[PDB]
Design a binder for this molecule. Sequence first.
Ligand SMILES: [Ca+2]
Ligand SMILES: [Ca+2]
Ligand SMILES: [Cl-]
Ligand SMILES: [Cl-]
Ligand SMILES: [Cl-]
Ligand SMILES: [Cl-]
Ligand SMILES: [Cl-]
Ligand SMILES: [Cl-]
Ligand SMILES: [Mg+2]
Ligand SMILES: [Mg+2]
Ligand SMILES: [Mg+2]
Ligand SMILES: [Mg+2]
Ligand SMILES: [Mg+2]
Ligand SMILES: [Mg+2]
Ligand code: NA
Ligand code: NA
Lengths: 232, 232, 7, 7
Amino acid sequence: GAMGSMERASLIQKAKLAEQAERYEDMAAFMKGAVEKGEELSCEERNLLSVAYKNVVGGQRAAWRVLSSIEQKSNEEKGPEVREYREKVETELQGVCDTVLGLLDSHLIKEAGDAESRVFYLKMKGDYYRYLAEVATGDDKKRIIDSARSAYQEAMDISKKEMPPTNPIRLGLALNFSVFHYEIANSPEEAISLAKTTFDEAMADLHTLSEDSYKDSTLIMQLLRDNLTLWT
Amino acid sequence: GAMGSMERASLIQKAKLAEQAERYEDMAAFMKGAVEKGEELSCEERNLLSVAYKNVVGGQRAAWRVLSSIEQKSNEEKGPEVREYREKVETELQGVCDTVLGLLDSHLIKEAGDAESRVFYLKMKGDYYRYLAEVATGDDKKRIIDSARSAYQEAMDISKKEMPPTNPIRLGLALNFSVFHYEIANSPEEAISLAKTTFDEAMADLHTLSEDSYKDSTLIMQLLRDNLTLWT
Amino acid sequence: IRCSSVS
Amino acid sequence: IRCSSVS
Ligand SMILES: [Ca+2]
Ligand SMILES: [Ca+2]
Ligand SMILES: [Cl-]
Ligand SMILES: [Cl-]
Ligand SMILES: [Cl-]
Ligand SMILES: [Cl-]
Ligand SMILES: [Cl-]
Ligand SMILES: [Cl-]
Ligand SMILES: [Mg+2]
Ligand SMILES: [Mg+2]
Ligand SMILES: [Mg+2]
Ligand SMILES: [Mg+2]
Ligand SMILES: [Mg+2]
Ligand SMILES: [Mg+2]
Ligand code: NA
Ligand code: NA
């Protein structure tokens, strides 16, 4: 609670400044402080929170993949250093995911009553369990994978009942859930099916949108198509 | 001294792994730990130390410039937040420069007897005083500028006596000292003169070099020319 | 190439 | 453009 003495509005303002400065660790600490004020988050604030932690954990994941590759080639060389340093980065990454999952559990999800907020937070919960699953090997690897799948599934169920198929939150949830199927659950056919069905239902709803909403939805649709091109 | 329990060789090995992972804060902590073992550094180790801290302070300087620009436009808006956050980043940056200057003073420079090592460390001392000068405003701004200038000057004096004009350490020292003159000391004519004299004396010594040394020297000469093109 | 995902 | 410097 190093941010406990700062005003909620000042934390949000500084998160935006940190984003402009590409200081994403600062950004995430500011947004964590804002969440810990206990009030619900607006749409803009939810996106600040996600952007901040996505960039933090993204750097850790990229580092972990570099070190994992070196470790595997060194085991195909001697000394514990590569394993030690990989484990260090892995432990840091797990700590960030635990932090995010802790904010969602205390108490963002339980207070989220609207479709847009509940789906957003359940998608985040799936994402950060997915990041844990990327490095998991031990007793709980299967439990971690099913925590991701369950969060994504609950988000999908709400999103199909409460949001149009072009809604960018719904589209991004489907994109990331399809990545989960391909990369984590060893279910490439499920990944491809979900990406194609999501793309096709969004295409048939584009005619409703304004020009600005059209640009938002088609940007994510392009990512679905990019994945399908990689996978097929 | 969180690295005090790790072997010197393991610290160096992990610094190299951190460089491959683009984990420069880790890299700098590993190299700080290696310096604190008390032994002199090899050429490769000196370059690891410099690369690590250059990347750390480079991110801070870039953030500081973003925030400084926002602060100045907001004073041309209200609230202390932009100044507070700029000051935070500034304090962190100053702390990193103090760390580096402390490693040089305790005791890298005093043990450096060879030209290549002494010039390298005195150049670093000039650089990190220069980074302090970029953010300095108060009672010691002029003393900081003269600490940079004095370190660079001592390095220049040794380099002109002990190294050929194509030596990459000598070239990089001259490049950075010319940046000091242009950006810090408000001495653009001195900056241009130094860059041109350095470039011309290196050009006339290229005929001695092997192909590999030629590539090393001409890469830095290109940076001298790039600066001269900006400045003239 | 790696898969694309969003925040 | 900003000035070029080296480590
Ligand atoms: Ca409740
Ligand atoms: Ca001595
Ligand atoms: Cl380690
Ligand atoms: Cl540990
Ligand atoms: Cl957990
Ligand atoms: Cl602050
Ligand atoms: Cl403070
Ligand atoms: Cl100092
Ligand atoms: Mg308050
Ligand atoms: Mg759940
Ligand atoms: Mg098939
Ligand atoms: Mg030892
Ligand atoms: Mg000196
Ligand atoms: Mg003139
Ligand atoms: Na504010
Ligand atoms: Na080693």
